[model samples]
Target: DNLRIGSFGNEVVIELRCAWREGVLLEIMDVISDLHLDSHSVQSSTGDGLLCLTVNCKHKGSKIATPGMIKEALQRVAWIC
Candidate 1:
């Protein structure tokens, strides 16, 4: 599984795809918490045991995380899935 991060000014988008199973949502939320991204909205869908997650985020204060850093964090979560 691979997750993608896109940055647009102060906003960021995280796109994720994975096998549908237990604990995946929790792990993803944990990763988001660890990254300290202020989530604006989250939408997801599952079909044929495949999950697609999309998260919209805004910068926290004056700090914003980079795509590479976000990728690393998500990769850690994906490893267990």
Candidate 2:
């Protein structure tokens, strides 16, 4: 499930039901890489077998075209890092 607020510069919060196995992990890696984001070097346990990934990403310009671009980039992938 997901929720976003446009009032917060369109910042988004993504919640996962469970941690991914290795194959799913690589899919997320591809998302990060394709977004031109930095590598995932750190992770923390959040109980209930959940793992959170702290990812670094390059921010694109948020002019008129920005919203659509971000949406497209995000839509191209599944889940998150």
Candidate 3:
């Protein structure tokens, strides 16, 4: 329930909240980067026991990833936490 991704005109919007205080956030950002998605207007902040991030990405010319693909990658990212 901490993550959601939506596709918009030429962009994908990713809303994520992590209970972790460190690597999980960087890890997610790295995953997006590895997908050839350029992150823009990314907003991230930490408050109390939570961290929140909003990322809008413009895909490179390559084909876009299916939601399922993104989901699995993101899910696994949290597994190591």
Candidate number with greatest TM-score? 1
**Number of the top-ranking candidate, with lDDT as the measure:** 1
Better of 1 and 3 by TM-score: 1
| For model 1, the run of ten residues with the poorest summed lDDT | 72-81
Count of backbone clashes for each model? 0, 0, 0
- Residue-level lDDT of model 3, residues 1-81, one tens digit each, is 347789877788887776764577878888987776888878988787777778888987677776667767776675421
Tens digit of lDDT per residue, candidate 1, span 6-71? 989888888888777788876886787677788879998878877788999887777667788888
Error of 2 at 24 (Å): 2.2
Ranking by TM-score: 1, 3, 2
Local error of candidate 1 at residue 81 (angstroms): 9.4
Off by over 4 Å in 1: 79-81
Tens digits of per-residue lDDT, candidate 2, 1-79, equal 4412121342332223335454554565575455444442534345454445444343333432233444445445434
lDDT score, candidate 3, position 35: 72
At residue 8, candidate 1 shows an lDDT of 92
What does each candidate score in C-alpha RMSD? 2.4, 5.7, 2.5
